[PDB]
Amino acid sequence: AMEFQSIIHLSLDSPVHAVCVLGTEICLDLSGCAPQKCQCFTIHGSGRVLIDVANIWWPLSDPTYATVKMTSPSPSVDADKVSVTYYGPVGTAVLYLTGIEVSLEVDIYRNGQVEMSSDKQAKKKWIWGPSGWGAILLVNCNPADVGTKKVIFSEEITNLSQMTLNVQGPSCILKKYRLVLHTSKEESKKARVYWPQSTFELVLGPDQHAYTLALLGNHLKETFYVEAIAFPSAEFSGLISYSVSLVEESDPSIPETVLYKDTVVFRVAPCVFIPCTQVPLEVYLCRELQLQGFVDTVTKLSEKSNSQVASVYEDPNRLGRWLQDEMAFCYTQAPHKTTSLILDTPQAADLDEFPMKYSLSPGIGYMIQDTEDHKVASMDSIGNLMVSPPVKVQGKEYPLGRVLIGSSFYPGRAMSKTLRDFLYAQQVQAPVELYSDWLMTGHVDEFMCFIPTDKKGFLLLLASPSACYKLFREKQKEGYGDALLFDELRADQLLSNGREAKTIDQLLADESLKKQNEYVEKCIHLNRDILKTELGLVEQDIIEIPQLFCLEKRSFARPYFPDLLRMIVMGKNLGIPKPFGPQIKGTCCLEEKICCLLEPLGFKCTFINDFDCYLTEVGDICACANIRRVPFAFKWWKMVP
Template identity: 45%
Template sequence: MVAKQRVIRVSTEQPNYAVCVLGIEVSIDIYGSIPKGSTSFDVRGTAGVGVYVVYNPEVVTALKGPSKWPLDVGVEVRVTMKSPSKVVNDNKVRVSYYGPTGQTPIASAWLYITCMAMSLDADTGRTGMVESKATNKTKWTWGPNGEGAILLVNCDRDGPSSGNMDNAYPYVRSHADLQDLSLVVLNTEGPADVFESHTLLLHISMFDATRVRVFQEGGNASLSSYEHILGSDKLSHTVGCKGGKERHAFYVEGLAFPDADFKGLVYLNATLLERASQNSPATPVFTETVVFRVAPWLMTSSTMKPLEIFVCSIKKGHNTNEKFLEAIKALAEKAGCKLTVCPEMENRGDRWIQDEMEFGYVEAPHKTFPVVFDSPRNRGLVEFPFKKILGPDFGYVTREPKNGRISSLDSFGNLDLSPPVKVKGKEYPLGRILIGSSFPGSGNRKMAKIVRDFLYAQKVQSPVELYSDWLTVGHVDEFLSFVPAPDRKGFRLLLASPLACLKLFKEKQKEGYGNAALFEGLGKVGKITLDELLEDRLLRSDSKYVQSCIDWNRSILKRELGLSERDIIDIPQLFTLEDATATALFPDMVNMVVLGKHLGIPKPFGPIIHGQCCLEANVRSLLEPLGLSCTFIDDFFSYHVLSGEIHCGTNVCRAPFSFHWWNIIP
């Protein structure tokens, strides 16, 4: 039986009138006006009313007569309606009170009931379709058996190509814009005369007013017929009801992502109000609420299918990248991936496109689209995400510190995502966000709080903070990367390793190649032989320190991602310390771009042995058995000498996860 919704009082002095909602149980207060001398009662209803008497069988052992109930033992009367009324007051309930003899009623109380059908419906079953008359609309639950509607932040631009995101405007900008909104249907049925004394109100709280906007569907297909009824300073809207069976369609628009001050839940309410008289305030008869969770912004992992790779063109100055662009174009063709080149007039000399933005997406059962997260670094590429990425079915979001203070750690080369993992029985089917931070207790550079808070608030990709402040630039992509693999967990974690590099060089020295040199053929760059490298005490000291920093992260990654040593591959790499922070000595090979099985790896210019670079040969031997194709790309003068590599200079938009975020149990 449906839980009790409201109490209606009755009186023996005059009939009472009430409007009830189909499917909602009503308790009738039979004790408020008991006639003097009454000891029992009976209750009867007309055909459209279901009457139930609730009592304690341990107290009520026998009835006085075939249909009379005692009045002194807490017996309760409840009624439900069987169908909507055709006319007002067409259902009746009579309560008759009896004295000790129980023969003739002392008095009777009449209740006239008009039944309304009313249901506020949304896609609470997460099927992509509005579910009629669903239960548990007011509670949003996680997991594959969870219930609750989902709302997208309408942060793309389906309207005119100039201007802001669609949700910056209090009107529907195009028919495509409607697809990003969530449909809600208010179904009503009942006699028109009800609305002479009752009002049906759609409303939101003042707390949700900045996070949601509602449009009412008009009578035709024109955009102007969609009326903005809720949001901002509009907290309530009277729904015009003419009586009979009616369907009122509304479109709900998300305005804000979950964040530090917003858990992501918004509430849409429909309330039937009764006015006792023209001069008295209205009181609620019935309220129905649908709760929505705003879809989080989701990152993608480098192991996921690449759709489009972005790279900047730099033609001016000494560090042009025309040959680099040719190599990236060839790699994109191999991977079957679209290539977009950001011209110099748009990048304004800023080649570090990975640092400027991070591609992700939003998902609801009825719609999914990519969303670019614009970092607060604000250098030459500052306008590119908003002006060139934002567009039809491509959203935009950003977070900027109010004080304007940022560090290198706020660039998104310092933001990564693991592939899906399972850790101590807990599954992370959408991976875990990786953020570079400072060493515990050091109190140095950290990613801005407003950005970190946003990432944590998305909830479903539970962030892990690593130690990256030991690097001069300070980004996690300088010492780690993920590549797909056909076995085990479906991926490998690649970690830069000075010790693995020194071990390789010592082996080559013992084989008699001590005179083989780094940077052979680079002309302007002085060569360094293996003998010279291995005799350099300072380099050995730097390598020991850098390895300890990477090993600290190795422990965190193993613990937080549930990895074993078999899931990790050490990539040979040397770093040198300058002013107590580390920079890659030769092009940093883990700072690669991953396009499916095709890897674009910085060409390290290592010692040439048997006609090939021993560093390249070593990396091939580690990665090619996994079915990966290694393409070494020369980025020495175009990126490496400027303190970055291929990953820093490229950015990839990838296919979304097949796993639906709402099926997670956080």
């Protein structure tokens, strides 16, 4: 008999000639051919064979099976043997073996190189955690792709994951078969596989899910380079598997058959967002022909903070403040490479040009993410997200922090199912839903800010209208009720921005303003509870920041004076919006209050003088920034979501 299978029925008469793929086990039926007078048996194998008898003689039970496996490939056909000798009160059975290797290997232990997997079945599984395993694939974020044969540079080839195919066996056995490297039609739309000729040929991708390789000689060693196309999403878990099938070429009436298949599994790394507690590397600035105020002060602050400034062009096809509202700096990481990128959720239709590519420093990626709602003040954009610092909550670690999404509480505007599903599909920053649709912009950054400390490693700052009323009341009692909110601002600057200079006395007697702020205070308190619960915070982690709001067009909250919470956080250097509060002998009481709260904790407060920038209405153009920061040192794959 001639065979390629997991079960072999030995025959006293004809010895079996079989193929053994290395890493697999064959079950040997020893008793089916045994003579009736046989009571016991002995079994012996050659050097490359490992025989297991239920883990020397053995009693002959009703079923008697032995398992065999091979340790190295055969240098010729039938070079290995297993012999069974039947003892009674009488027969021999023989199996000739030829061992071949057919294996696909990846960086399964996440060490930065392809390593041989210890087990053919364990290698199809992807296990999270430090005691886990499973290779990682990175999405191609090359900004050129935004809007068959390719040249790939040594700088770009490190982004790709290796997948090695090894086949070893006698030439006369291997020539009977063909190899097919493949994946399912659906998985092929999610990644590309390249083969170097440097010049690389596309062997698998969205239009090709099977690739044939000829077996010429006694060994084939080929390395393929793989890249993902998309991050995990509602429709995509992140898992992609590749297989090599050994196909027996046929007689035209009998179809071909697959005799063996080896499979590897990749997990496409998630898109990870970065909180403002991470060290700034670069500050991207969309100036919109501005210099004095925001642009100059933020340029100065950035130099003071060991950070680069990258100019950003205006995009005439987008609403103003797009650099902040439609984009986020994030990263994606593999054992062999970390790719920082900007994730863009454009609100405009049919875009042709992408001016943000001029600013992107070498190696910085660019990815687009679709959304559904594109109106002014839409919360369906990546700007409607804030990242917490790393926290432990109820004994559960969130080493990369948790993503915070602005949402609604009235049973209004919201993030689309598409963008929300994309976020939850990343897994490693378990999203928390906050309440922000009471704010005109819908952005939580108008009432909260995390700042790093040199303990949890951070403090949460929260907007507090009650704290501001308390501060103004104390000043009034001290005889400063005549001090003026919006002092040192030009009358037309106030009028053109919907504001009016008011004394502390007029502000404290304004019952409508007080009711607007009481409403805002209730909305912030709802969020304070969710943040304490979901981030494991205690009140010692929170600092109240005096901040007034007003309701504009139900109506929505807007900062009354420039929002102190809208900080540019650069380590210990804080770029705080200059609020223009009531002055008490040449000093703004709001600047003095916030400096008294933050300076003793090691913070350097720089007040950004730019009233028009901070009072810009939603949709209107203004200078803005987006800071690119150091990715977390904690490796995402070692987390157990």
